[model samples]
Target: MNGVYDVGGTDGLGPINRPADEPVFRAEWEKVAFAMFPATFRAGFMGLDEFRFGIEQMNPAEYLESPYYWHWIRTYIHHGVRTGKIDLEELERRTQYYRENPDAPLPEHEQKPELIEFVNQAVYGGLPASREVDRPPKFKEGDVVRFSTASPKGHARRARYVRGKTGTVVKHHGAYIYPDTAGNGLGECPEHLYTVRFTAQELWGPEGDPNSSVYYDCWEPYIELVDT
Candidate 1:
């Protein structure tokens, strides 16, 4: 009877525990950030590097718990304030304005495809390229492994759902590009990648077991060999 639920004074379900140092920073203009729709806060602000940097400064628990857009908005606000694009006072004023008037006049800018494409483009010696450098695979199919579960500072594809989870190697994917972990808009570096497969039951439990297998293409640093 003295289980985790009993300690928390709850039924079988327990309250989600969050780290003490979670980022208290919330953008005053977050509503406006969402109103922009597909135009993400990262694109609206300094770019992907700054956004990634913001995430790095956050508590890993907060980073894992926060939504993708929530993280983006927070990063944008932090950078905007630091870079003086908008100060705390200005942000408060803008937030109040947007909250009071949902249809307020918005900033205008032609979203040239190039602004985003620049982030995705592969470059060699600062020139556009049709080819990229090559690298070797570190793990092959049928390999058993677990994500290190050690959080890193930056924008990572790994979600809280997959941390410490076990999976089997499924496929190898050539590097497309890696997000700038430093939030400085740096380009990709070649690395071995693999699609790891896990049973839904393994990831989620009985409710998830009905669904088919889940496969994730994880970067090498995120994983380690699981002891059989």
Candidate 2:
């Protein structure tokens, strides 16, 4: 949705802090955050689109302030509470108990072998969005195309900079789950996907490097054939 998280082409935030050498997990708790996605998905709480919507639902201030995995944790809580998988009242009670008795050990967690295997595989081999569909692709390699101007105030894979812009289709990626529908609580509305290439000048005008271009994956409905 058009929550505070649609910072796609917004400028003037700051430089990204990418360390020259970075560890996979900065802290131990992040590992739990990493595992939560597949774990919850295995339990039938939410899919990838629903998980993304959860992150989008976070408070604007906290979203920017917190570390990355905090978003994951927030996402889990968002769906967890809504789907009745997480009891908010009991969670608060446990949280208060831990807060008062800081040294107290946590309750023993039940283990599920099936979920454990699935989550472990998912951590490395992410769930696939690609799925087979009967419809043929709309565009093909080298075809000129234009991005759609219609911006839905819901989950989408579209980038703001590419809206209403012209580009050339460089590749076809077949059908995949359309996030706009799926993230909005709809079923997987699969669409043909393509890689569109746009010149830097097309996006940034005089400030852009004419020699540089960007490639963006665009769903079939998100773009249309351009007239010569």
Candidate 3:
């Protein structure tokens, strides 16, 4: 799953465009597109990591250049089709209709007021990544650990920059769904999560800003014990 989605620590992508008064969403379609997340997640057909894996599977150029919500839309469609929950041909023609007529009102569909409450809860109540697991934490605060250099073909949250690097555990964040396996169809295997920190110098060498530090929330399997 190593792809353009892992942009942490990469350079030369130009500066982030910061519009001073950015709205919650930049487009009207983005609002409804964003709504799909909580509802789909509520359906419980996929793991959070599996959702991410769909995004990771995008074409490099489109993934990089398109608006962020478009990534979500593509992934939704990708999983929707794969699950047989969506009909691509009809969806495509509907899309074509919209593209051809921007002002056209979407044909009404079934109304579910009951489902709206769940969406509201999902957005406001929010989903917690934490879980109750019998597994004791492997590493504690102040422990030094090293991330493996070998890359995983399976879906992972471990960013490329952190691989093969040594970092200190800043906090044990309790057990959470292990995305590494969850996204790969292995199930929601909960594992210890932590706030691991590294010196900029440790991660970037001489070019690293010596005054800075980087912290990543690492799942247990992403790192291992180190003697020093």
Candidate 4:
């Protein structure tokens, strides 16, 4: 999963600029792209983790060059096509129709009231990631640990910047669905989650400020106990 998308510590990407006033939806299509996930999920098409993995599966070059919502749109189409809910030929035909009639309004379909309510609750009520599991935590608060250097081939929560770096266990966040398995359509495979704190210098040698630090919510499988 380590590819162009993982640009945490890398340089030369250029600075982020914030304009005085930026519109939320840059284009009308972006709004449609945003609604795709909640609507599809409410229809039982895919899970949240599966959606994320679909984005990660995007081609490295395309992932880097495209805008943020482009990724979401691609994920939506990929899921729909893969799940048999959508036919590629039908999709192509619809796309061509839209292209041929750019000024025409999109065809109307019956709205699902339940899906709207589902999206409303999901956005406002929030979904909890934490879950109850039988396994005890391997490392606790105040324990030192290091992330494994092994680069996982699939989707992973472990950031490349913090891999193999030493850090202190700040707090135990109980159990949560392990993303590594969940992203791949596997079972929840819950594991203990921990907040690990690392000194900036530890992560990025002399360039990083010595006084500063970074904290990441690392899953238990990503770390190992450091011998005293």
Candidate 5:
């Protein structure tokens, strides 16, 4: 319900949904405190998914209270720096000055989509590779496994609590896409492919039962085979 956009904006060819810019809701503040933009614009932008995930992860109370745009912007900035596209010192300086002097020009580099290009180039070590993969999964049908709970510092597909936890592998999805941990600069890391399925009780405990089953196409590094 939260992510659906209002109708407006255009792509020359036709109208596309523009992300709603409506003010953060008061009632939502009580439910949980939180909070993209155009598709092409979003595709080039950073931390959009992370922002949505943060809201999904939040309890009703915190999601609504948290500042909109503000959270994603901060997460975007952090990702930008971590991916080596921006200099932290420069970003901090810009932030400080921008607050005190609204008239000052914002950091030009921060505003550009070229950051994505820079990241992509560095990660692939020059020309980026094609995403196509022909191989089958190293783990086949009916394999039981557990995710690693160990906290890894950079961008990873695995959720923290689910790590080291057991689940049966329902199906092999074949190799698909990977996340932009290094941004698109690294291209897609084929080493991490997709696989899917699980019951709630398998992931959680007996209390986790029955409402619905969850499915995820996790990358290879996040999972390991369960011995039994």
Candidate 6:
């Protein structure tokens, strides 16, 4: 799962530049792309984690070169094609047609008033990932734990920076759907999510600031209780 997308804690990425007054979206097309996600989800095309996995599946070079929304749009197309809802050859032809006829009118989609309202509500009313599960947590607050060193080939919430590091369980957030399995269309394997606190020195060694610490909400499967 380690890829160009996981740039956190990496050096030489350059400083982030923020505009004085940035618009919500730089292009009109971005608005549609934003709406497309919830719309597709509402249509039962894919789950949130599945969409993320789709983006992750993109070629590393292509993924890094594209804009943020481009990732979403491409993922949507990928899902549509994979699910047999879209014809690959026809999609290519239509794309070529649009490129050749730049000024041509886009196809109109007439939706019922109720459907429009549903999409509007779905887009604005975000979905929560947390879910209730009937299981007790494996570790409790004040427990020392070490993150798994395993490098999973599929999607995972375990950040590369925290892998193999030891931390203290600061809090236990009740079970939520485990993303690693859910993202791969495996199952909704819910697990306890805990906020693990690690001193900066523990993670970064001599280069780390002694006074600072990092807290990450790690899933149960990502960590193990340290043997006393």
lDDT string for model 2 (90-197, tens) is: 889988998899889767888879886786687689878898999888789999999988878778877777889999999998899998888888899899989999
Reference-based lDDT, each prediction: 0.61, 0.85, 0.86, 0.86, 0.52, 0.85
lDDT of 5: 0.52
TM-score of each: 0.52, 0.90, 0.91, 0.92, 0.48, 0.92
User: What C-alpha lDDT, on a 0 to 100 scale, does residue 110 get in candidate 2?
Assistant: 85
Error of model 2, residue 76, in angstroms? 0.6
- Displacement of residue 80 (Cα, Å) in model 2 is 1.2
Residue pairs with clashing backbones, model 6: none
Where does candidate 1 have its weakest 10-residue lDDT segment? 1-10
Q: How close is candidate 6 to the true structure, as a TM-score?
A: 0.92
lDDT-superior candidate, 1 or 2: 2
Model 6 lDDT vs. the true structure?
Answer: 0.85
Clashes of each: 1, 0, 0, 0, 18, 0
TM-score of 1: 0.52
Q: In angstroms, how far off is 146's CA in candidate 6?
A: 0.3
lDDT of 6 by residue, 20-84 (tens): 89788989889989988877877766798889888988888788677789999888988898788
Candidate 4 RMSD to the real structure: 1.7
Residues forming the 10-long window of minimal summed lDDT in candidate 3: 38-47
lDDT for each residue of candidate 4 in 1-228, tens digit (9 for 90 to 100): 787777889898777867889889999999989888788887766777778878888898898779899999888888898788989899999899889988988779898788878988999998787799877889889899999897877778878999999999999989998888887778689899999999999999978897899999889989999952
Q: Go through the candidates in order and give the C-alpha RMSD of each one to the true structure.
A: 10.4, 2.1, 1.8, 1.7, 12.0, 1.8
The residue-by-residue lDDT of candidate 5 on 63-127, one tens digit each, is 44555555544444454564576688987888788789978753365455775565555558643
Off by over 4 Å in 2: 120-126
The sequence of per-residue lDDT tens digits that candidate 1 reaches over residues 1-228 is: 111111211244446676777553345456555443334443455444455566566555566567656766676667767666758898899989989998977888677786456534523234321224465666778889897676554455566667788999888675444543424445455456778997888777788756688887787777788743
Tens-place lDDT digits, model 3, residues 1-228: 678789987889998888889888988889988888877777764668888898899999999899999999888887888788889999999989989998998778999898989977877998787898987998999999998776788798878888889999999989998887889888878999988899999998978898999998888888898853
Displacement of the residue 39 alpha carbon in candidate 3, Å: 2.6
Q: Which residue pairs clash in candidate 2? A: none
